[PDB]
């Protein structure tokens, strides 16, 4: 969940949890969750030569 404008709209709104053998990472949040609202980011503090 990163708030990008979607590239393409998805058709065929069909149950996805049944066919979860495909895909490489599957998550289903019930209604909402605090894992979505995380912003841990990595920082580089300048280099020295």
């Amino acid at each position: 969940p990163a708030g990008i404008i979607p590239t393409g709209n998805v058709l065929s709104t069909i149950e996805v949890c049944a066919h979860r053998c495909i895909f490489d990472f599957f998550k289903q949040i019930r209604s909402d969750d605090n894992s979505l609202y995380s912003a841990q980011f990595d920082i580089l503090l300048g280099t020295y030569c």
Partner: protein
Amino acid sequence: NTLNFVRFLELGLSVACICTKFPELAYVRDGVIQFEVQQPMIARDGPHPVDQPVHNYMVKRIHKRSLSAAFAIASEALSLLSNTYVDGTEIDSSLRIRAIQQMARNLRTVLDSFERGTADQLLGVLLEKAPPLSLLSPINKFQPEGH
């Protein structure tokens, strides 16, 4: 008694640190700093292998700590502040002002504690960082290069 406020910058220890603000610090996972150091070289002959100049790349990472201080309020102070049981007479206005004076005199020292304790943390980290002189001096002297 009027306690005297200490600003960390005025202390002579401030010369040992490069302070900088960073509001979004709680979101940093692994702060990384980088180095790239090159070394010189001399040329010789005879039964010595011809050498090549070397480069070094060193990377260090941030270590995170924290500071905490407390601040107390008695029940009567809350009762006077919330105005829940006020009677609108000059007797309790003095009590309210006494409570507020206590709160402000307290908050001043609480805020001062962070300034006073940054120096403490710097001393702590510098002690945890320093190897003893009795070892460091001969080591940095009796070996020319290493290996």
